[PDB]
């Protein structure tokens, strides 16, 4: 409401463009020594266990 005010309604084209890098990035998982379940790297896991 104060000095900071947008001049024009950002075109729906520019909006989407802005959100370019906005996309997500899939998590990282690897097979584990116990089951075949995919544990996150450098981590234990429920219903799996560990050692030492």
């Amino acid at each position: 409401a104060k000095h900071p005010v947008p001049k024009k309604k950002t075109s729906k084209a520019r909006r989407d463009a802005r959100r370019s890098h906005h996309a997500l990035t899939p998590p990282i998982l690897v097979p584990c020594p116990e089951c075949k379940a995919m544990k996150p790297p450098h981590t234990v896991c429920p219903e799996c266990g560990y050692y030492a």
Partner: protein, 112 residues
């Protein structure tokens, strides 16, 4: 052959779940399952629950084998919004718009 599964009226912003959906866009059932299992988002919970049931329908209603189905396509849709009030300085009221979502997940048979 394909098996749909939509979760209408879900308290959550489409934009937020859209991210979740786009992750499993055209992926193996198991492949997707793992993504949802460890992905760090609230939209995960929902996209998962629906995607899951989608398989249930594929099997028990469309003679599709779990071990051979992927994500032919999937998308989320924007539903009716819950407008609310918001007390503001100098006595101003503004409408906070808690939108909702219609998560449409569909599967399909692989190849031959």
């Amino acid at each position: 052959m394909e098996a749909k599964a939509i979760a209408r009226y879900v308290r959550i912003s489409p934009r937020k779940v859209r991210l979740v959906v786009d992750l499993i866009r055209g992926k193996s059932l198991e492949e997707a399952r793992n993504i949802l299992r460890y992905t760090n988002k609230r939209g995960a919970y929902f996209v998962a629950k629906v995607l899951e049931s989608a398989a249930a329908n594929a099997v028990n209603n469309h003679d599709m084998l779990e071990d051979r189905l992927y994500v032919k396509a999937a998308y989320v849709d924007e539903g009716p919004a819950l407008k609310r009030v918001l007390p503001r300085a100098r006595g101003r009221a503004d409408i906070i718009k808690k939108r909702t979502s219609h998560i449409t997940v569909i599967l399909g048979e692989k190849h031959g």
